[PDB]
Amino acid sequence: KKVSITVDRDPVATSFEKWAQPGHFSRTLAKGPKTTTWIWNLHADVHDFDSHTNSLEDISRKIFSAHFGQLSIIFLWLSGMYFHGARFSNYSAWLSNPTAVKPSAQVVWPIVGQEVLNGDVGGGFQGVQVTSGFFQIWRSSGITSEVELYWCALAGLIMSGLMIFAGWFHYHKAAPKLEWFQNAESMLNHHLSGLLGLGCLSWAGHQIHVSLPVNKLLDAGVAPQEIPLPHEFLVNRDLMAQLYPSFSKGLVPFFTLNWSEYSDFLTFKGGLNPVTGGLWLSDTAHHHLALAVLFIVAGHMYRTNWGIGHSMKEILEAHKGPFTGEGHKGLYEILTTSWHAQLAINLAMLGSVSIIVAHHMYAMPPYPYIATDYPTQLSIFTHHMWIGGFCVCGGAAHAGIFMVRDYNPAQNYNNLLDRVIRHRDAIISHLNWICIFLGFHSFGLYIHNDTMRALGRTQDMFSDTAIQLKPVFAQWVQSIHTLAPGNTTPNALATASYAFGGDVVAVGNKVAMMPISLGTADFMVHHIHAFTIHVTVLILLKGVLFSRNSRLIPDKANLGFRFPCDGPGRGGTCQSSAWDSVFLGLFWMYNCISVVIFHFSWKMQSDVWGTVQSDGTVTHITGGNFAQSAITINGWLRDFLWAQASQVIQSYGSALSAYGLIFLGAHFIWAFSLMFLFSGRGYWQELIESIVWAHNKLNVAPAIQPRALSITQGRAVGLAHYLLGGIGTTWAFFLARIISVG
Amino acid sequence: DFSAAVPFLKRPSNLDGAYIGDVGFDPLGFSDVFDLRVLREAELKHGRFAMLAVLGFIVQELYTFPFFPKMAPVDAHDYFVKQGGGSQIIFWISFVELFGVVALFETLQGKREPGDFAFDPLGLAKDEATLERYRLAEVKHARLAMIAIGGFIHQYWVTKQTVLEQLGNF
């Protein structure tokens, strides 16, 4: 029983004393401010626990309680989304008429004329149109009334109180010891089996006993208040049998392994529900049940307290061949003693999963009536692409912090890390070459096309009409997925997604999904994507691999993760740290995700979204101009940015005038950021000297001596305002455009 | 040692007869986490409100003031929400509760017993021994009335008859 619970009782006293002493957590800051830099230095390093404390136990305790605090904030946020849906929304009107009422769960107060933002969203309601897709989530859950939304808001509030209590309790009353946190096998067993498997299983039970009957009654056309309450499905099996007759047999088919009895509600239909334009909820129920079994089985892999199971260290140490030295030896010790190494992995995975979520949710729209709510589809794609890109760059930020701080060569002799660092010149030179080749042969095709179109030579272009770059591999994969139902997935009835090919799905005379054809423009923008992803990897990988030392600075690890430079010598070593590669790689992340969301926005408006009409023909939002105009830069400038900025710039005096104002405000903030990015600290310190003189003249100089921001903070302020302004401008443009036309 | 009330439950250990009416009953362990002066403040405040409420529920059945219309106490709540009297009662309670906040801070700082507001106009507490028995009776009545008020309101909901008339009928 070496996996055991071990707790220190009453470690830290619940006192307001250290609240009154800002900077108490570090020896430098606790002696008080003398310059304004102290103030910035206070906020910058506060959650950097391993810079204040030496011991891994106290660091682990602070992290566990901070995770409860984050959970409390998320639960309060969810409770507020449910409360605003219950109290300030037109959810009931939306349930009666989804394809006509526009969701709105935010109402403004009348103060300075701002009540113009309460536009006519429909259903006898005035408010701000919301695009988070909560209404479709609630309808998929089977909510059907505001009263149940009040109970969900209360459940969120109770959970939020329980998490903030638990964070206090587990830091101040009962803090686990380090040997409790250093149980990776136990934690994985419980998080796979218990967190994921039970979670999937419990959700599958809700879908089978609540979501599936309520939604079958809704899609038959029954009014929401005419639908029986969800517990009458739980007790009276006769009504559930009337909807799905397999329930007449109960749990005998489950236990005797006669599982094909349950095919009424555990289907493998594929495709979309024609009524709602969403995934079949019988498919999602079978999906969650299948995942639950796999996750619970996965949870029995690792050894905890009874001899069955794997040792994770033995698995890692056995995988070594003739190219890779000692192999994965020493990685277990890293990943159970370094929090930063774990955060680097988990941030890269969370970001990757968020980008996958973004792709899978527009192509296989899971919620009822979310496919034809085009503002929601554009919003949730753009949001999860930005979360993915940010989390992916934070994985490289904390890989750099690991290398600078937690990496020790004595325990990493001739293993995989040692070998990567010992051929990092070959890695970065080959990646650098790939980024040059791929920028020439992706963006230079655009420059070739602009020049030929400008010269009158349209036969010399890379286009469908002229020289053709055909995405043959992607077209072939689309063919395979269209041929799959009945062939390589024989029990499937429809394709996984209509994007691959097949029918046009229309809901409320709007296209839910239809095949997304690929041509020369799709080949070109996909290689644009491959190029922007490659260089972002190069900037972040070069920062992680050269974080400790280079040919330039042989002792970079002694300066730390975040230092501004090592002086003007050696020609100049400005921005040589690992932090400065995270700083430079967030710009290239911004560039990559901006072209991805622009590609999505133009391609869906041009070729997928639109209104079905007589004869079955479809009129798209921008009328199929992507194919012949996404091949030049002038086409993107004119037919995408200029043509679609009409709604944001003409929005004044309407309910979308808020987007019109945020468009300008973010354009302003973006420009304001370049003051911090193009300038240097020394100018601003000398300007502050003359302003200090004028304060000295009037005897009003402060005792906290004003300083220009540090070199690193100047870079961080410039990057933060750059990201805010660029993303905010895209946010305002995307939302005003798709609310007006979609 | 074991709890006096529940023989098989252990004594909580923050409850050693410091507060009158203690019988060692605290299974969920709120005194192991929270301040007992604050909890006894809350127990006596909830109990005093409940004791007044039960007396009000019965007397309001027996008599009502001539200037107000006759009606049942839950309907009285809704009528005085819309009439303005409820806001007056809420305001004056809130006004007294301001100096109650000051009183609770004085209790936390150690210089006041949790339910003591020095409210003895009629001098009933003649001696210290009389006060101990009286505050035991206050604690017991306060707890009993919390249970009682819940019963009257919930039964009124389930069967639309007032407490004296429900005893009178059935």
Binding site: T256, L257, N258, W259, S260, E261, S263, V297, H300, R303, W306, G307, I308, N491 | -
Partner: protein, 69 residues
Amino acid sequence: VPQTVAWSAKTGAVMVLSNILCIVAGRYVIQVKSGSFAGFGLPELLASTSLGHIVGSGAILGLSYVGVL
């Protein structure tokens, strides 16, 4: 839809077979613990029988799929 069958003694047979198979095979393969009377305890029995119901359920469903039953 793949065809499954109501429980019969053949389904019981497949379950019993897979269960005994997993006892013996697990007894050799498991690396931490009189062929079955040395060091055989409840977690080993419960693990071999859990893999037995996994192998047996897969075997029953597959043999029902192909027609062997």
